[PDB]
Amino acid sequence: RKTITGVFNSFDSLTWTRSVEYVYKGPETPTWNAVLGWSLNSTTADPGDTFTLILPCVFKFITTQTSVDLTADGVSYATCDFNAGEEFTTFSSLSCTVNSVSVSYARVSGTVKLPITFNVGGTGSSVDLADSKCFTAGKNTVTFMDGDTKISTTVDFDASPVSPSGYITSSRIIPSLNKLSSLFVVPQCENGYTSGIMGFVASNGATIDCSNVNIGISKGLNDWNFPVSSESFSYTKTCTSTSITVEFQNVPAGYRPFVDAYISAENIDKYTLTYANEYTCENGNTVVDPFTLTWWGYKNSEADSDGDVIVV
């Protein structure tokens, strides 16, 4: 019947372990494991009571589980459903319910390990542009919220090692949609662009979702080479289920044109894109520099928990 708060009472550790090939270590890279302390007291929580944990700047959980239980010695005290932020919200959450149990307990406390990745940008969507300012390279405090209470720990987030001068690409699985977002940022022209053509063509096995496309110019890029703004400029979009192409005219100095689209793949863990990549800098000659990338999925992990019950 009631909402309780403060069930998640500590943020114990935040540790990265590689779950994908190729990608540098950074906030978005699968997988970060957050270990949190949790406690339930039967004097202050009844079966059916609900509680929620908010995870700011978290894109998704790196698990196919729909829920995780808060357990101690193989008894389930509560069930928490995963609610990924993805492109809907800037934060993720757990919506939890206290479970009925077959024998009484006085109180129980333990820890829970949650596989997550953080959102620090990746498209021109409102969510990603907001989250592009979530963290900076180096030392950051990561804070989650349970009601009005805050639980935090420190972490070192590495910047992308890829030079911001060249083109930037990124592919991100959006699990609840069985789709990816795929980004292309044009190489830098320091004093602006006269024109260019940006986009990609999908090989058999994947298609472009023309209903979820963002085109913009960003005022620089962040520590992970992602757009931080999306302003308008003169362009023509040509989008088909096989290809997206954007031809554009002048872009000012300090801005970076980019395009992103959703991709539906028959095999979400493998698709190929051939990128157009044409640009003409102001006071420069036209560069034509197509390339191809085959994008490989990451491995999922499971959330789990442990704890100790006091009986009385």
């Binding site: 990608v23 990745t117 592919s171 991100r172 990338l293 490989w296």
Partner: peptide, 7 residues
Amino acid sequence: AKQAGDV
């Protein structure tokens, strides 16, 4: 021509 990973 090159391999890359998803996030």
